[PDB]
Write an enzyme that holds these catalytic residues in place. Structure first.
Site, short mmCIF file in Angstrom:
data_model
loop_
_atom_site.label_atom_id
_atom_site.label_comp_id
_atom_site.label_asym_id
_atom_site.label_seq_id
_atom_site.Cartn_x
_atom_site.Cartn_y
_atom_site.Cartn_z
CG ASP A 51 22.00 25.07 -3.46
OD1 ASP A 51 23.08 25.55 -3.06
OD2 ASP A 51 21.09 25.77 -3.93
CD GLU B 276 23.69 36.10 -18.43
OE1 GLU B 276 23.40 36.84 -17.46
OE2 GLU B 276 23.60 36.46 -19.62
N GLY B 277 23.51 32.07 -14.71
CA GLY B 277 24.23 31.50 -13.59
C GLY B 277 25.60 31.07 -14.09
#
Lengths: 65, 281, 133, 42, 298, 103
Positions: free
Chosen positions: E123, E11-12
């Site tokens: 990012d 997961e994020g």
């Protein structure tokens, strides 16, 4: 097995856009709002706006579906 | 960039006949879906009546994105109208009401472009009661995924405004024959609105739309700018490319010429018949 | 010690529960009716009881090295013997060193007393301050 | 490889405060057929 | 219906990623479901969708599909076994200058494509540089990525992982160019040469202090017109460590690449294109072929 | 004080990790072969059971949880002074020459 740089030929269907460095000495940047000193403190140079506008102007002209 | 975009690849069609084919296919699909599930009821809309209602609700979409309380940027409005055009290119007005899809297209354009607007603000921009605003937000959220699915997840729309500005820059730079190209700016804004009213966004590149606006403003103001096409664009040598561009521009100018705005009585009748079609599902 | 026991039965209760589930699943025949899912229920409910049981014995603190012996399957009881030999032997080190360096204090001070006649009283003070009074 | 429990204590946040999300209905995968099992001794 | 879950990748904070296989091409993909108030589809997911739908490069992740159901969606990318972070942190596998050059070449080629398309991967860090078993590096997530060309747009200064943040973003530049990606690329190269995060900061002020004490505070002839940024604060004049001391086993060409990527002036900082044209990438140790790049086994 | 793991925390993690592991397995079991689904359960049950055996020995040992760390620190403290004196003495040898040079 060395590496040779190739300029990433992506074919825009339109007239040629002059390079970003060869863009203030062709006269374009006189007609673009000058970047503020704060803006110039970052990576913004008022030729990014000019170059993007010219690339979208000439992106597809010589192209129909 | 447009030349690599999904707008060029999928949402740029060869003729108005292909557009009419797509819309008639969508209308026929809805009609057959209604018939095959419990056969020629006059409650249905015709493809041309659907196009009239689509023109009307695109006008209302411009009106909403123009009175938006935060000043909506014009790229966002162009994106929302493009979404409306595509969604109803492949979907029938009787399945999804164009007012909810109007608001949903505006919502998704506000989000896909980075015009950061909170949902309470967005529904506060609606001339309805707070209860009506809440219900409109509910419907927008219900229909947002449907809108994104019907766009085939192609959310980047290229608008003619940035090519318009880039042409203006190149024109002030390499075209000394023209002095003060901002009279062209006003008149080409007018023509660009006119041409956004039609289906030319699905048929020509934004660069071609911008160049047609500019050269149309010149022609109306008496300026000849064939030296900007043949020279300064090096169409003097590839004559076929120059004639091809001129044909594109003439075709799209005529396309704006033949556009007939939705009526006032016809739109009233179509709205009433559409709401009768939606009430009786 | 009542809480110590109370936690222990629940821990061994879970171990028996795992075996029953393992045997039931291993020896699975159509002649079993509602006897499998009930065992799993006793397991899940058994796990929850342990969380309530670890908190009344919260005061117990397990040393880091002790759990290391448990993790490797070592002999934690031997470590208690090792500590016992550790303390007993090293208690002689602190005392043995002290006694080793206390006799050097007592004898050397006595030697200073036999060399300087005019500073006799001072040397007696050195021994007095050399004690922990 | 059996020193996990020691390693498990340096990262308590791996398990949130009380318990992880649980759905008993979703545990229907524990409905098992009657089949053999090789490479496994009881 | 068309994809079958295979593994619970993780997961994020806005997604759940599962390995999956499509029933149409038996190709192994990574499906990314987005979680769920009164706003609709999450904007990070829409940004992934909109930006990755109009990019197609060898070295940028591509969403092979996108779909969803009531109030939630799932993207479908190439399945990427690892990222560059697990390659960096794994002490077992070495990174020879050829391996470093390969990672840098793939990163900068992907980023050169992305920058020619006026998109800015705001990012960039070893965590977000995935790579498959074929050893093809791909820029991972675009949930905070934008279009940097047009000026009328007021960006945000807080968007990149602190450790890989350019000095101008820490100084609060609301407008920036490709220098943010290039600074993060220089930091990735530094972490790739040292195997430990270059300039690991505890805060924006600490990140700036470490940048300045490692490279020297800019003297306004190196970064002219610096003092105009919204959150500029003057710093003690640090000398900075010479680059041939930070990276004691890097060639002179690699040192020139480091110096270019770590220029304070966000306009004198080299771009991906001119970085690719420097003698480093053309010198004798060729980049390793993606087949010979090391993979962290388990 | 620091050199020691709380008994309650130690029990807390294993219960949840076994629960968390089980939940992870629950997803994989339905989409596995008939003969393979049993392997995971048997291996998980045996592996999980072994993890719980460690706690059983840990609890039965809890009677000595109070007087093991006390002697461990005390023994090191005696060892520290016992060796610090030796490390202390080695320093003087240098000082008996270095200090004389400094003076």
């Amino acid at each position: 097995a060395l590496y040779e740089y190739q300029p990433l030929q992506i074919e825009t269907y339109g007239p040629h856009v002059p390079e970003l460095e060869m863009l203030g000495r062709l006269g374009y940047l006189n007609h673009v709002r000058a970047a503020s000193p704060q803006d110039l403190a970052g990576g913004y140079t008022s030729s990014l706006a000019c170059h993007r506008a010219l690339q979208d102007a000439f992106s597809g002209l010589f192209w129909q579906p | 960039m447009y030349h690599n975009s999904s707008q060029k690849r999928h949402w740029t069609f060869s003729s108005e006949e292909q557009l009419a084919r797509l819309r008639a296919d969508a209308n026929r699909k809805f009609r057959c879906k209604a018939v095959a599930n419990g056969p020629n009821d006059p409650v249905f809309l015709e493809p041309h009546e659907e196009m009239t209602l689509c023109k009307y609700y695109e006008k209302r979409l411009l009106e909403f994105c123009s009175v938006f309380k935060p000043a909506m940027p014009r790229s966002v409005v162009g994106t929302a109208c493009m979404y409306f055009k595509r969604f109803y290119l492949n979907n029938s007005v009787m399945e999804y009401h164009p007012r909810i899809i109007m608001l949903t297209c505006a919502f998704l354009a506000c989000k896909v472009d980075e015009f950061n607007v909170s949902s309470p603000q967005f529904v506060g921009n609606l001339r309805e009661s707070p209860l009506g605003q809440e219900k409109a937000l509910e419907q927008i959220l219900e229909y947002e995924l449907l809108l994104i699915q019907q766009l085939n997840f192609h959310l980047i729309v290229h608008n003619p405004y940035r090519p318009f500005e880039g042409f203006l820059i190149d024109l002030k730079t390499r075209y000394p024959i023209l002095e003060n190209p901002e009279i062209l700016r006003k008149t080409a804004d007018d023509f660009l609105n006119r041409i956004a009213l039609t289906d030319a966004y699905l048929l020509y590149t934004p660069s071609q739309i911008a160049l047609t606006a500019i050269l149309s403003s010149a022609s109306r103001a008496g300026i000849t700018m064939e030296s900007y096409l043949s020279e300064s664009l090096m169409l003097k040598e590839n004559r076929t490319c120059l004639s091809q561009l001129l044909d594109i521009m003439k075709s799209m100018r005529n396309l704006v010429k033949k556009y007939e705005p939705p009526r006032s009585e016809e739109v009233a009748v179509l709205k009433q018949k559409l709401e009768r079609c939606h009430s009786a599902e | 010690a009542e809480k110590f026991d109370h936690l222990e039965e629940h821990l061994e209760k879970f171990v028996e529960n795992i075996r029953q589930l393992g045997i039931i699943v291993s020896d699975f025949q159509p002649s079993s009716q509602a006897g499998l899912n009930q065992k799993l229920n006793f397991i899940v409910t058994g796990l929850q009881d342990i969380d309530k049981c670890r908190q009344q014995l919260h005061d117990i603190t397990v040393p880091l090295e002790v759990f290391e012996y448990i993790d490797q399957g070592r002999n934690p009881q031997l470590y208690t013997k090792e500590c016992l030999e550790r303390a007993l032997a090293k208690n002689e080190q602190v005392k043995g060193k002290i006694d080793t360096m206390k006799k050097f204090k007592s004898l050397l001070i006595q030697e200073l007393s036999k060399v300087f006649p005019e500073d006799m009283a001072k040397y007696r003070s050195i021994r007095g301050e050399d004690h922990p009074p | 490889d059996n020193s996990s429990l020691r390693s498990l204590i340096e990262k308590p946040p791996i398990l949130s405060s009380s318990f992880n999300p649980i759905t008993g209905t979703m545990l229907a995968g524990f409905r098992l057929h009657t089949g053999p099992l090789p490479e496994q001794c009881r | 219906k068309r994809y079958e879950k295979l593994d619970f990748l993780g997961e994020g904070q806005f997604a759940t990623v599962y390995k999956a296989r499509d029933k149409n091409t038996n190709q192994i993909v990574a499906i990314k479901k987005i979680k769920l108030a009164k706003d609709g589809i999450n904007r990070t997911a829409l940004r992934e969708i909109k930006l990755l739908q109009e990019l197609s490069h060898p070295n940028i992740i591509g969403l092979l599909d996108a779909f969803g159901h009531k109030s939630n969606i799932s993207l479908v990318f190439d399945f990427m076994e690892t990222d560059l972070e697990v390659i960096i942190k794994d002490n077992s596998l070495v990174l020879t200058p050829s391996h470093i050059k390969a990672y840098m070449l793939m990163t900068l080629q992907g980023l050169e494509y992305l920058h020619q398309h006026w998109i800015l991967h705001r990012d960039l860090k070893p965590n977000n540089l995935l790579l498959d078993e074929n050893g093809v590096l791909k820029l991972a997530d675009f949930g905070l990525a934008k279009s940097f060309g047009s000026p009328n747009r007021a960006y945000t200064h807080q968007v990149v992982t602190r450790w890989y943040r350019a000095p101008e973003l820490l100084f609060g530049a609301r407008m920036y160019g490709v220098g943010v990606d290039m600074w993060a690329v220089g930091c990735i190269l530094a972490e790739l040469l040292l195997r430990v995060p270059f300039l690991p900061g505890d805060s924006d002020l600490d990140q700036l202090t470490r940048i300045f004490e490692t490279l020297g505070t800019p003297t306004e002839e190196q970064w002219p017109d610096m003092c105009s940024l919204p959150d500029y604060v003057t710093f003690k004049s640090f000398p900075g460590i010479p680059l041939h001391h930070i990276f004691s086993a890097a060639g002179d060409d690699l040192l020139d690449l480091i110096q270019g990527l770590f220029l304070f002036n966000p306009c004198a900082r080299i771009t991906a294109t001119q970085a690719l044209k420097m003698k480093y990438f053309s010198n004798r140790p060729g980049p390793t072929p993606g087949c010979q790049l090391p993979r962290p086994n388990c | 004080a620091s050199p020691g793991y709380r008994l309650s925390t130690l029990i807390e993690f294993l219960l949840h990790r076994a629960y968390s592991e089980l939940m992870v397995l629950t997803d994989l079991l339905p989409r596995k072969s008939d003969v393979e689904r049993k392997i995971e359960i048997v291996q998980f049950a045996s592996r999980t059971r072994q993890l719980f055996v460690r706690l059983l020995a840990l609890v039965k040992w809890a009677n000595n949880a109070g007087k093991v760390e006390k002697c461990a620190m005390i023994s090191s403290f005696l060892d520290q002074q016992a060796i610090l004196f030796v490390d202390t003495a080695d320093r003087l040898a240098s000082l008996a020459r270095d200090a004389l040079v400094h003076a």
